[PDB]
Amino acid sequence: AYSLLSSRNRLIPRVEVQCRKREWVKTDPDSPFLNGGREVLYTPFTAVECTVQPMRGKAIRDQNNQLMIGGEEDYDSYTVYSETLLFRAREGTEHLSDQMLLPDSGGGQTWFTVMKADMYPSSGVPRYRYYLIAVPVGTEGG
Amino acid sequence: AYSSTSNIARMRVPLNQQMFENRARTIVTFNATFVEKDLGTFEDIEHIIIGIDVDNPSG
């Protein structure tokens, strides 16, 4: 079985990041809809150690500021290697995708939503790879 | 001569993915008249000969 990869690295620096779980709930008392007035509940936590890297190409959809008919919108993304388990959304449930807070190109800090998670069930070592997309500015995603 | 005009449409076109340029477009229709010259002529009628036959019962 794997031995070296089953232990923490000692050459490349790694950092911890903050995250938060997400659910949703219905608030309207009389509306007949599952949506109602949707609300999201958060529960914070942290990842043991992570590595953050940017997109490699220069494709038009990967550029940071984009020109739309309204104005120069904003976009960011990352690829993350981590030893913590993060989950995407699951259907027929009230759980949403986990989010984690990282620096952006504008100098601030914003939340990124997990979109793709990679796992190797037959190997055993707990090492994962994630792909993240920054939440739209002015909202908390979906 | 001038005849009529079409709708004037205003447009915005991105440039270098940074700026929107103002533009417009229209179609103006004019009348005209074109003249061209033939490549020759036919001959004139200088002499005409006509044959006549008057059918009658006396001969």
CA distances from B30 to A110, B24, B34 (A): 60, 20, 13
Question: For residue A16, how many C-alpha atoms fall within 13 Å in the half-sphere facing its CB?
Answer: 5
- Burial of A60: CB neighbours in 10 Å, binned 0-12, 13-18, 19+: exposed
Cβ neighbours of A68 in B, within 8 Å: none
> Does residue A104 contact residue A110 with C-beta atoms inside 8 Å?
yes
Cβ neighbours of A67 in B, within 8 Å: 14, 17-18, 20
In whole angstroms, give the CA distance from residue A44 to residue A140: 15
Stated resolution in angstroms = 3.1
Q: Which residues share a beta bridge with A21?
A: A43
Residues in chain B whose Cβ is within 8 Å of chain A: 12, 14, 17-18, 20
Q: Which helix (H) or strand (E) holds B58?
A: none
HEC assignment per residue over chain A: CCCHHHCCCCCCCCEEEEEEEEECECCCCCCCCCCCCCECCEEEEEEEEEEEECCCCCCHHHCCEEECCCCEEECCEEEEEECCCCCCCCCCCCECCCEEEEECCCCCEEEEEEEEEECCCCCCCCCEEEEEEECCCCCCCC
Nearest to A77 by CA among A107, A105, A47: A105
Paired sense of beta strands A42-53 and A15-22, if any: antiparallel
CA distances from A29 to A23, A93, A94, A95, B27 (A): 19, 20, 18, 21, 60
In whole angstroms, give the CA distance from residue B36 to residue B15: 47
